[PDB]
Design a protein around this nucleic acid. Structure first.
Ligand SMILES: [Mg+2]
Ligand SMILES: [Mg+2]
Ligand SMILES: [Mg+2]
Ligand SMILES: [Mg+2]
Ligand SMILES: [Mg+2]
Ligand SMILES: [Mg+2]
Ligand SMILES: [Mg+2]
Ligand SMILES: [Zn+2]
Lengths: 149, 27, 82, 106, 100, 182, 129, 49
RNA sequence: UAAAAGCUCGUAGUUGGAUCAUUAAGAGGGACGGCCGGGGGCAUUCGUAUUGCGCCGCUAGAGGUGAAAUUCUUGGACCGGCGCAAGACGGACCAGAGCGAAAGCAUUUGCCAAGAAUGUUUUCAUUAAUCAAGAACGAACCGACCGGCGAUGCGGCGGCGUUAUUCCCAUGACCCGCCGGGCAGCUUC
């Protein structure tokens, strides 16, 4: 049930029943951590961190190996993102379509898509304000959005 | 195949995502 | 309709159903060990890989991402794990 | 006119391409080609359609074959090719990998 | 020029094209729609009647394929607060009636 | 089309017999799905190939064999009218096509009797055959129906024209007053 | 969104009951659902049922015997005393010789006959007959 | 009764539908690949003994 | 007389999984991978037909109708040939197929942003549903009533065999089984 799409897809990940690390995995809980630290220093998002470990190093779930999530581990070391990843990507998309809308005055659909994107931004901003992740004075402005990201 | 990844390196390797990426940039 | 036991499904039934519509969810993917030519060091590669995997020793292109299962290079040898 | 009308059937895909190519002796020509997707002998599906990207890949291969076979030769050699339409046969052979074709003509 | 007057005159001339036998049978149909009592259908042998129905179904079926090629309860419900979607809703004023 | 392929297969022994009288050959290509007619050395009439081409066009338009062969006679002509292009909307096109046929097919046969031409409506084509003066009248009314003016006006107009032809007087005089007005 | 996992479970059992089905799968599972099923099961209305434990809220597979007429839930959850308990039975159930009303009390999730023995009232959950 | 008659007709479609789908495999696929089981012993999962 | 226009977003209100912080919902959000579409915008380009104009050839008519009449013609109408310019339109291929929130969408090529479904042992962790008010756009029998059988469009998985084959460009066409979300039929409960 997508918010702006009538169709309801079912494509998603299915976690296995077992939570124990496989025997063939030769990496330790400590050794995974600096790999996360090294890749984060390179400038990769935490969602991208898991994909690299999954594809190449055979780490199916970092939470099962180290006992902590990627964001929690990075927060402890101090490599914390300034803004939440999900909110940051939507702001980046809003800037890109807004820049495109300057040079195409007749693009009606681009105007409509911008409404949907900013609606999702306000919904996540209100939720992120409640969890005290964002200060209770942060606002999304079109001119400020370029400087934000 | 290697060339196709290198074109995608710009999008997937960010320069202002983390808080540390701002503070060492301000120096 | 045909009579099926919801508690005890048949061997061909559970492998045929969708991964989310089974009694207990179970993925259809797996991990495999691949051996590239040029150097016979073993690399662990996910079946539905989304990035090109390079051998650590010799930097040879192992697999190319596709829509579904990743396609392996010619001459490579692979084995399912676990 | 009658030959063109008879080839256009109802349950197949038509691909057309055109180029502007200059010969070695200065003659500038515009060439047109037509092709039709072909049903296999063992095929049971009623319709034989090619997807849009397959059409463009076929259309692209149409263009360079005419381009290469004219700019290298002169007007005398081009006419000798046009009499048995060896250009159409070459296009049909090259496009078998993408989608089988028949009735390819200049 | 009246369309209704013209519509009938166009119809009558066309039906004569069908033939005098077809002229008659179509004319009976028009009177029936106007309120005339239908003639009684003749009683036939049930075996013969069953075969005729089978041929009519086949005739209808073949017409469909050609078209494709060209392309009273005895008792009410005993079960019927208000119950919707598996949930029974009781009004607070109704609850006092249960208490009293 | 293939739904006509079956009927053409059985009647092909008959059509080749009819055209062999004029010494013009015919070939039915099942793989290509084509009807081909070509003249020979024995043939002596040059125009008969035009009458031969007109025949195979009618058969592809579902016109029956007995009606189709009659155009081979010199007195009869033919015309295939394409009505699909007139209306963009498909539902509007179907509605006006049903208006042309009318209730019980009466308006079509009312057209048929007044024109003295055989008319068949199939798909987006209307096939009419008969005397040349008749075919001119058919093309006007069939196209006019697609132009959103009612066929009943044209059919009633023809009836007035026929009875005026009976009366020899005022033949030179204009018929505009006698013709009905909206 | 889903409003009552108990009501949805009861509705699906009721619908499968009307269709003559032999087994029904209900999800998600809950402790309130399990206690409600056991009360109905003690009177021979459904039969044995199984709890399948995935790591997300569980699933239940229930056998059917064809003896169920109507099962439902009560939205107000009004607080009922023991002395008043008679009036709720007549105004809800069609008859007085069969049918049960399920209550949740300080003693537990328990039907109105057992409430009379324990002399305890509480909030009303649902009914079945 | 129409209740029983409808169920008999529907179940016959199901059984026959599997049969074309089954024979399309065996006619194509190699004889060794597809095992063959008798209809009687098809319903016996195991014998503990 | 208790007598017989639409469509989408969206505020208030209404209302919202499991567990005794955990899990990671056949709840929702995002990212990633290869594709897909007459979806939208900007440029570019081709095709006949029609009309008008210029020249060449020929000579009394041409057009229209039921019959005529308005009109055009020896300063050359109509007809035949060659070339140029203008306004539309995009056939046949074209399907109950596809795309879009709806209204609607069809020549070629380049560019810009957007999107559905599918694949996923990636990421967040309740962030949701319905909505008066308000905002954007806008031609000219009945009921979420469990299912089944066939085809059909896209994505994925597996496979005996045919068919082409890959410097670049590209790894397909056919047949069989299976899983999803769609456009529709025929049946059932
Ligand atoms: Mg997705
Ligand atoms: Mg989830
Ligand atoms: Mg994507
Ligand atoms: Mg694209
Ligand atoms: Mg597109
Ligand atoms: Mg476009
Ligand atoms: Mg497919
Ligand atoms: Zn190597």
């Amino acid at each position: 049930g997508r918010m702006h799409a009538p169709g309801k897809g079912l494509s998603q990940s299915a976690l296995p029943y077992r939570r124990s690390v496989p025997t063939w995995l030769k990496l330790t809980s400590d050794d995974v951590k600096e790999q996360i630290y090294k890749l984060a220093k390179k400038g990769l998002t935490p969602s991208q961190i898991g994909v690299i470990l999954r594809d190449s190093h055979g780490v199916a779930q970092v939470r099962f190996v180290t006992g902590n999530k990627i964001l929690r581990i990075l927060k402890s070391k101090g490599l914390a993102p300034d803004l939440p990843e999900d909110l940051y990507h939507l702001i980046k998309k809003a800037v890109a379509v807004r820049k495109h809308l300057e040079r195409n005055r007749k693009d009606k659909d681009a105007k409509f898509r911008l409404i949907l994107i900013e609606s999702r931004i306000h919904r996540l901003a209100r939720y992120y304000k409640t969890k005290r992740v964002l200060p209770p004075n942060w606002k999304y402005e079109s001119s400020t959005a370029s400087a934000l990201v | 195949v290697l060339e196709r990844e290198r074109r995608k390196r710009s999008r997937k390797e960010l320069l202002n995502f983390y808080a540390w990426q701002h503070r060492e940039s301000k120096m | 309709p045909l009579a099926k036991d919801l508690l005890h499904p048949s061997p061909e039934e559970e492998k045929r159903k969708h991964k989310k519509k089974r009694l207990v969810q179970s993925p259809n993917s797996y991990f495999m060990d691949v051996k590239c030519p040029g150097c016979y060091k073993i690399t662990t590669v996910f079946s539905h890989a989304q990035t090109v995997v390079l051998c650590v020793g010799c930097s040879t292109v192992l697999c190319q991402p596709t829509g579904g299962k990743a396609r392996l290079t010619e001459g490579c040898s692979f084995r399912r794990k676990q | 006119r009658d030959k063109m009308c008879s080839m256009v059937k109802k349950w197949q895909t038509m691909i057309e391409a055109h180029v502007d190519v200059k010969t070695t002796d200065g003659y500038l020509l515009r060439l047109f080609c037509v092709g039709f997707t072909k049903k296999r002998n063992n095929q049971i599906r009623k319709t034989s359609y090619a997807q849009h990207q397959q059409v463009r890949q076929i259309r692209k291969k149409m263009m360079e074959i005419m381009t290469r076979e004219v700019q290298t030769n002169d007007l005398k050699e081009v006419v000798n090719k046009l009499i048995p339409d060896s250009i159409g046969k070459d296009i049909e052979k090259a496009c078998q990998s993408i989608y089988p074709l028949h009735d390819v003509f200049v | 020029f009246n369309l209704e007057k013209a519509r009938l005159e166009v119809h009558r001339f066309g039906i004569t094209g069908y033939g005098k036998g077809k002229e008659r049978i179509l004319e009976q149909e028009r009177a029936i729609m106007l309120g005339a009592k239908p003639p009684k259908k003749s009683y036939v042998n049930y075996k013969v009647l069953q075969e005729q129905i089978k041929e009519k179904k086949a005739a209808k079926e073949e017409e469909k394929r050609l078209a494709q090629e060209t392309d009273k309860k005895s008792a009410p419900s005993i079960l019927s607060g208000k119950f919707k979607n598996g949930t029974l809703i009781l009004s607070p004023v109704d609850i006092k009636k249960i208490n009293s | 089309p293939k739904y006509r392929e079956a009927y053409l297969k059985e009647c092909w022994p008959l059509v080749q017999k009819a055209l062999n009288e004029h010494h013009v050959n015919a070939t039915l290509d099942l793989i290509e799905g084509s009807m081909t007619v070509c003249t020979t050395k024995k043939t002596f009439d040059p125009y008969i190939i035009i009458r031969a081409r007109d025949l195979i066009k009618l058969l592809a338009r579902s016109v029956s064999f007995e009606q189709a062969v009659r155009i081979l006679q010199d007195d009869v002509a033919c015309d295939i009218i394409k009505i699909g292009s007139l209306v963009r909307n498909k539902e509007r096109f179907v509605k006006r096509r049903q208006r042309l046929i009318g209730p019980k097919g009466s308006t079509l046969k009312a057209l048929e009797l007044l024109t003295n031409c055989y008319i068949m409506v199939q798909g987006n084509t209307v096939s009419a055959i008969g005397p040349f003066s008749g075919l001119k009248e058919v093309r006007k009314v069939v196209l006019d129906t697609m132009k959103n003016i009612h066929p009943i006006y044209n059919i009633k107009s023809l009836m007035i024209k026929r009875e005026l032809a009976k009366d020899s007087e005022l033949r030179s005089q204009s018929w505009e007053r006698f013709l009905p007005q909206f | 969104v889903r409003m009552n996992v108990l009501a949805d479970a009861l509705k699906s059992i009721n619908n499968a009951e009307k269709r003559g089905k032999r087994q029904v799968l209900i999800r998600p599972c809950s402790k309130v659902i399990v206690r409600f099923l056991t009360v109905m099961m003690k009177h021979g209305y459904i039969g044995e049922f199984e709890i399948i434990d995935d790591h997300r809220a569980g699933k239940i597979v229930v056998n059917l015997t064809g003896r169920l007429n109507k099962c439902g839930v009560i939205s107000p959850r009004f607080d009922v005393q023991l002395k008043d308990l008679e009036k709720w039975q007549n105004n809800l159930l069609p008859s007085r010789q069969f049918g049960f009303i399920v209550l949740t009390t300080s003693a537990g999730i328990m039907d109105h006959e057992e409430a009379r023995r324990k002399h305890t009232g509480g909030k009303i959950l649902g009914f079945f007959f | 009764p129409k209740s029983i008659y409808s169920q008999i007709q529907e179940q016959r479609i199901m059984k026959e539908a599997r049969r074309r789908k089954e024979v399309n495999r065996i006619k194509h696929s190699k004889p060794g690949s597809v095992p063959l089981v008798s209809e009687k012993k098809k319903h016996v999962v195991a014998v503990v003994k």
